[PDB]
Structures are given as structure tokens and as C-alpha cells.
Amino acid sequence: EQNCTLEIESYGYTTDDIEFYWRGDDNAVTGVTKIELPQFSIVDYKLITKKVVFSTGSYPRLSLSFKLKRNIGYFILQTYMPSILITILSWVSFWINYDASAARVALGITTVLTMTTINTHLRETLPKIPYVKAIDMYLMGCFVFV
Amino acid sequence: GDVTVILNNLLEGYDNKLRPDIGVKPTLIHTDMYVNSIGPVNAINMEYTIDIFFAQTWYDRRLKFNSTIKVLRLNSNMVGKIWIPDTFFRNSKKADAHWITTPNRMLRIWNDGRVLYTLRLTIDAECQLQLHNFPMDEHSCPLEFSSYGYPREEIVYQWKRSSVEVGDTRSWRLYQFSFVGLRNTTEVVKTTSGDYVVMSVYFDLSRRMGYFTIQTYIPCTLIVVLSWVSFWINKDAVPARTSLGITTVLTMTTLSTIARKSLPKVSYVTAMDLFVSVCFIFVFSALVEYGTLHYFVSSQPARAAKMDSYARIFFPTAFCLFNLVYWVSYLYL
Amino acid sequence: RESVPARTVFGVTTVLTMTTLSISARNSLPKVAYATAMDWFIAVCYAFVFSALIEFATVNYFTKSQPARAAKIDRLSRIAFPLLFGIFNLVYWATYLNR
Amino acid sequence: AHACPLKFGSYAYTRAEVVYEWTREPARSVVVAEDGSRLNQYDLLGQTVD
Numbered sequence A: 001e002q003n004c005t006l007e008i009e010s011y012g013y014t015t016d017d018i019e020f021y022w023r024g025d026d027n028a029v030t031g032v033t034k035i036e037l038p039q040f041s042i043v044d045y046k047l048i049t050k051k052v053v054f055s056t057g058s059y060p061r062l063s064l065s066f067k068l069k070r071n072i073g074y075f076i077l078q079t080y081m082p083s084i085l086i087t088i089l090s091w092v093s094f095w096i097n098y099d100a101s102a103a104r105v106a107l108g109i110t111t112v113l114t115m116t117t118i119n120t121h122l123r124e125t126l127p128k129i130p131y132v133k134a135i136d137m138y139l140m141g142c143f144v145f146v
Numbered sequence B: 001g002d003v004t005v006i007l008n009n010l011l012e013g014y015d016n017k018l019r020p021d022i023g024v025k026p027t028l029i030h031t032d033m034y035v036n037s038i039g040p041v042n043a044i045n046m047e048y049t050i051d052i053f054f055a056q057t058w059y060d061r062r063l064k065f066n067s068t069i070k071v072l073r074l075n076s077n078m079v080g081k082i083w084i085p086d087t088f089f090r091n092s093k094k095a096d097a098h099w100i101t102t103p104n105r106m107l108r109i110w111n112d113g114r115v116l117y118t119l120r121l122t123i124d125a126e127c128q129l130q131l132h133n134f135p136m137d138e139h140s141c142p143l144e145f146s147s148y149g150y151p152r153e154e155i156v157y158q159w160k161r162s163s164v165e166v167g168d169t170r171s172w173r174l175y176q177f178s179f180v181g182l183r184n185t186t187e188v189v190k191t192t193s194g195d196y197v198v199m200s201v202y203f204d205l206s207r208r209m210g211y212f213t214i215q216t217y218i219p220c221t222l223i224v225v226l227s228w229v230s231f232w233i234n235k236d237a238v239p240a241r242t243s244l245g246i247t248t249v250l251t252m253t254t255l256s257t258i259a260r261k262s263l264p265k266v267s268y269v270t271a272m273d274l275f276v277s278v279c280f281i282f283v284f285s286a287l288v289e290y291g292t293l294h295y296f297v298s299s300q301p302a303r304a305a306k307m308d309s310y311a312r313i314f315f316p317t318a319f320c321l322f323n324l325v326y327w328v329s330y331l332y333l
Numbered sequence C: 001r002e003s004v005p006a007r008t009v010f011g012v013t014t015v016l017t018m019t020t021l022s023i024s025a026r027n028s029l030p031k032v033a034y035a036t037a038m039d040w041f042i043a044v045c046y047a048f049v050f051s052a053l054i055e056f057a058t059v060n061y062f063t064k065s066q067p068a069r070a071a072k073i074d075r076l077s078r079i080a081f082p083l084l085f086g087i088f089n090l091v092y093w094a095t096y097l098n099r
Numbered sequence D: 001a002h003a004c005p006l007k008f009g010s011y012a013y014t015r016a017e018v019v020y021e022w023t024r025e026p027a028r029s030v031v032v033a034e035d036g037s038r039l040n041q042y043d044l045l046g047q048t049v050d
């Protein structure tokens, strides 16, 4: 979940020269429920009014905050199901009787190939967050299992 | 000669801050459009471009003159000196007029005070596509516009007989959709400021499947029918059947990528994505079926003998049943 | 004919190569909603590869039970498929270079 | 590791007309807010003014 804010302040006028408030204080912000985000969902929003104290004085401030919860269906179907299915295909090597070495080698190493291809395509398509994430951990788990 | 005097008189004792008949009655504005084009509809951002000629006609009794000339036909030069309605497009992510070589406005003032004001706009309207039945989906995306500051009791919009009219409809930059028709509408919306007359021009579009057929449906279908070959391959060709199955899996994943590559990250099962998932499940099932057959060989060869003959007819018939149900259900919407 | 793994690997891996090539070519093309000349070429080529692997499927099915007809169909396929591809290429290039 | 610079100065006024100096000590005249680090890849260690 992401807590995305929008901060509204006065540049030069201080609290003893200007005051901010929400007109209604519960119904000042409208249209949040009608928003349709393809990838997220507005679970909650809040309105805050305060006075931030800076060195030279107190300045009025309003804050509009949203809590975005990212949908999971797309990620499941496009990243997690394929990984698990390739993992099962990797497991199929056990039922194949040992004496067939070409078949077991082909199955195992081609499952490794497919796992790598899926991982690289997910690199390519997904947003480029260059630090470690939960999805990265899951794909490493799957690749380790293969 | 005389026209300069007419204009100087017209703008003498004028006040462009006040709408015509500020305190008497609402100003009635007749609006026309001429859609030069409807550009791409990129489902990723849920927006569609549109290039139009927006014309508004109203009545201003301050701009009434008497003279042998029945109409004054001016440039954009005067547009900034007389009152112009603050019409704006309520569903535009980013719109802009055109300014080359000279502002693309147009002003015309008649004897009786009728003003006609035309400009050329390119509007990136927003419409939230409901991406079910992809790629067999049909949408109706609006271009809405209303005054920004004048409520219902100050400015009222009103369509005409031939208000909105399309052009060739062949030079349009529509790629995957196809133009089918349009409708004009008028409503009154409630806003924080007041009640605003909102005018709408719905444009109806239908996606065209000539691309997704060749891209996904045909290759996925052929890959499945190719994976079936393992059944007819003898049961002793163990490495051959294993490689066949797994290579078909790899190809199917390659295809499943390009499947979704086109669409935004909608978190629901679209139709084409359901199709590709089902094809991948069929390939998965074929490979695991061969695996189970191979495992049963060493234990019960008689039991394994009938499994191949069962699968040979159960897989094709199952796929045909799925295809019939699918293509019938998604085209009945 | 006995080299069943070898011929199966040709079939499947050539299908994979043609898949990749078609994906790349239609990635290069804009996302129009109708068939282009390159798209027709790709479609016919993919059909040809599918036909090749199907011919293997049938020849393998018949082999070890009817070698005479297996070899007969294999020989006709050898003689025919290249000829059909060549005629397709000739007519295609003619029709799309005359314009 | 990198040292990304932010160099500013006066355009059109030379050293003999407009001289710039930090209002306080050099490293106390450029302050990064405590929540002001919008980097995914790197880690802002610290600044160094001059």
C-alpha cells in the first residue's frame, strides 16, 4: 500500500496573516469514490488541517491523503501462476524413470531455460524498481527449485 | 474607412468582464463541432485524441451596429476585447489550440448582435475503457464541455440541427478501432459551484480483431494442435515426446508474453488473456499426461495402452468444445 | 526415419524460431488491425513449418507398421514442399512488386 | 559511487562585481530535508559544499 499525500501551504503569508480550512471539513473533497484506477484502489482518504512551525513562524497547511492498495490479480496470473506451473513441470522429471537420461536432462534444463525466459520477460515488462522486491524473492525461490 | 469607425464605436463603452445580459436572462450559446479526426485510442492511458473545429454562437446586444455592411468578418485580433464564454472540456487530460502561422480563431459579428466565434482544437479526451471482451470490445467515449464559472442560470448551451459532423472518416488515425457513429446529448450536473449545463458528444468505437487473430489466436491454436502430436508419437520415443512437450511449453510462454504486452495492468481476466491461459493449461496437461503415461508403463502396460487412445480424442474434442463455448459466448455480448 | 528425436527437435525448434521471427517482425510493424504483405508471408511460412512437422507425425505413425507407404509419402513430401514454397515465393514477389 | 555536482553562480557579473558566499558555514548552508530522498537505486550519503 502507498500513502500518497498532497500538501497545500501558504508561501509568504503566515498564520497571523492567513488561515486555511476545509470548506465542510468532511465533504470538502469530492469525487474520490468515483475514481477508477486500473492498477490501484482508493481504500481510504483523509483531510488534515494544521499549522507547521518553521524557524520564522507558523504557516498554515492542509493535507489531502490517499491510501492506494495495489491490485493483485494481474500479478498473480502473469507472474505467479507461470512460475508455479514451470516448477511442476520441473518436478515431472522425477516420475520419468531414471534410465531415460536424455529425457530427464532435456526436461530439467529446458525448465531452467523457461524459468530464465519468464524472469527476463518480467524484467522487461514490469516497472524498473532497481532494488529487491517480494516478486524478485519469489522468482529466485522458483529458479532455485528448478 | 467606415468599418474602423464601426469597430471603434463597438468597443467604446464596452466591458468584456460582464456576460451579455448579466442580470436579465441566461446567455444562450449554440455550439457546433466539425471533427477533423479522431486519433489513436491508447488503452494504456485510457485516452483518445480528437481534432475539431469548435464554434459557438451567442447574442450580444452591445455589439449591434447599423450600416450597409451586413456582417463584420474579423481575425483573432478582436477576440481578446469582447466577451467570450469560458467553455472548457470536462473530460480533457490536455487540450490545446493552434497558433501557426497566426492564432486559429475567427470572429464574426452580424447587424443584430449575433456573434460567431470559431477556433481549432486538439483535445486528448479521457474515457475509461472497460477492457472486457478484449479484443472483441466496443466502447463509447465522450467529449463533454460546459462553462467553467457560469452556472445554469447564467449560461445555457444548445445544440443545432447539424451541429456535430464528421469528415472523411478514412484519413482518421484510428488503428485498431473503427468509427460506427456518434450522438449529441445535454444534461445538467451538480458541482461545488452550482448547476452547470454539460453538453456531450459520444463517439462510438469498435475494436477490430484482424490483428489479434493472427498474433495470438492462430499461433496459440497451432501450438496446441502441435503439442497433440506427442499422442501419435510412439510411447517408446521418450526423449522425443519430452522435448516436444517442453518446447511447446516454452513457445506457449513466449506467446503469452506478447498476449498481454498490449494492454494496461488491468487486474481482471480479459477474454484474449483467458484464451491464452487456457491454451497454456492445455499444453501443461498434455505434458503431464505423457508423464503419467510413462510412469504407468512400468507398472500396468495394459492400463497405459488405453490412456493414449483416450487422450487422442479427449484433448481435441475438449479443445473444440472450449473454443465453441468461448467464441459463442464472447460474440453474443 | 529412425532418428525420431532428431526430426522431432527440428520440428519443434523450427516452430519456436518461426514464432520468435514473427513476433519480432510484427513488433517492428505498427499495431494496425489488418494483414500486411509481410504478415501474409509470415503466415504462409508458419503454415509451411506446421505442415512439415505434421508430415513427420504421420510418417512416424506409419513407420514400423507400413515402411513402404511411410517412405513413399516422405519422398513425395521431399519433392513437393520445396516446389510449393518456390511457386508461392514467385507469385508473392510478382504480385507485390508489380504494384 | 558518484559525486553529483550542483554548481551555481552569477551570469554576466564577474568576480569583481558580484561575489557569492554561503550565509552560514559552508556545510550548514545546504541542508537536505530528512524525508527528502527520492532515489530508488542510490543512497545519498552526504553533501559537501564549496
Ligand SMILES: *[C@@H]1O[C@H](CO)[C@@H](O[C@@H]2O[C@H](CO)[C@@H](O[C@@H]3O[C@H](CO[C@H]4O[C@H](CO[C@H]5O[C@H](CO)[C@@H](O)[C@H](O)[C@@H]5O[C@H]5O[C@H](CO)[C@@H](O)[C@H](O)[C@@H]5O)[C@@H](O)[C@H](O[C@H]5O[C@H](CO)[C@@H](O)[C@H](O)[C@@H]5O)[C@@H]4O)[C@@H](O)[C@H](O[C@H]4O[C@H](CO)[C@@H](O)[C@H](O)[C@@H]4O[C@H]4O[C@H](CO)[C@@H](O)[C@H](O)[C@@H]4O[C@H]4O[C@H](CO)[C@@H](O)[C@H](O)[C@@H]4O)[C@@H]3O)[C@H](O)[C@H]2NC(C)=O)[C@H](O)[C@H]1NC(C)=O
Pocket: B076, B077, B078, B079, B080, B081, B095, B096, B097, B099, B101, B102, B103
Ligand atoms: C506560470 O508561468 C508560465 C510561464 O510564464 C505561464 O504560462 C504563460 O501563460 C501566459 C498567459 O496565459 C501565456 O501568454 C499568452 O500566450 C498566448 C499564446 O499561447 C500559445 O503560444 C505561446 C507562445 O506565444 C507565442 O505565440 C503567440 C501566438 O502567435 C504570440 O501571441 C505570443 O506573443 C508568442 O509569440 C512570440 O513568440 C513566437 C515564438 O513562439 C514568435 O514567433 C512571435 O513572433 C512572438 O515573438 C505558448 O507558450 C503557449 O503554450 C503554452 O500555453 C498553452 C495555453 O493555451 C498550453 O496549452 C500549452 O501546453 C503551453 O503550456 C501557447 O501555445 C498568447 O496568445 C497570449 O497573448 C494574448 O493574450 C494576452 C493576455 O490576454 C494579450 O496581452 C496579448 O496581447 C495577446 O492578446 C492579443 O492577441 C490575441 C491573439 O490571440 C488577441 O486575441 C487579443 O485580442 C489581443 O489582441 C490585442 O492585443 C494585440 C497585442 O498583441 C494587438 O496586436 C491587437 O490589435 C489587439 O489590440 C498571451 O501572451 C504564455 O504563453 C504562457 N507561457 C508558457 C511558456 O506556457 C503560466 O500561466 C503561469 N501560471 C500561473 C498559475 O500563473
Ligand SMILES: *[C@@H]1O[C@H](CO)[C@@H](O[C@@H]2O[C@H](CO)[C@@H](O[C@@H]3O[C@H](CO)[C@@H](O)[C@H](O)[C@@H]3O)[C@H](O)[C@H]2NC(C)=O)[C@H](O)[C@H]1NC(C)=O
Pocket: A003, A004, A044, A045, A046, A048, A063, A065, A066, A067
Ligand atoms: C498517510 O500519511 C499521513 C502522514 O504521513 C498520515 O497523517 C497522519 O494522520 C494521523 C491521523 O489523522 C495524524 O494523527 C493526528 O495527530 C493529531 C495531533 O496533532 C491529533 O489531533 C489527531 O487526532 C490525530 O491523532 C497525524 O498527525 C498525521 N500525520 C501528519 C504528518 O500529518 C495519514 O494518516 C496516513 N494515512 C492516510 C490514509 O492518509
Ligand SMILES: *[C@@H]1O[C@H](CO)[C@@H](O[C@@H]2O[C@H](CO)[C@@H](O)[C@H](O)[C@H]2NC(C)=O)[C@H](O)[C@H]1NC(C)=O
Pocket: B159, B160, B161, B163, B182, B183, B184, B185, B186
Ligand atoms: C443533436 O441535438 C439536437 C438538439 O438537442 C437534437 O434534436 C434536434 O434539434 C433540432 C434543433 O433544435 C430540431 O430542429 C430537431 O427537431 C431535433 N430533433 C429531434 C428532437 O429528434 C438532434 O436529434 C441531435 N442529433 C444527434 C445526431 O445527436
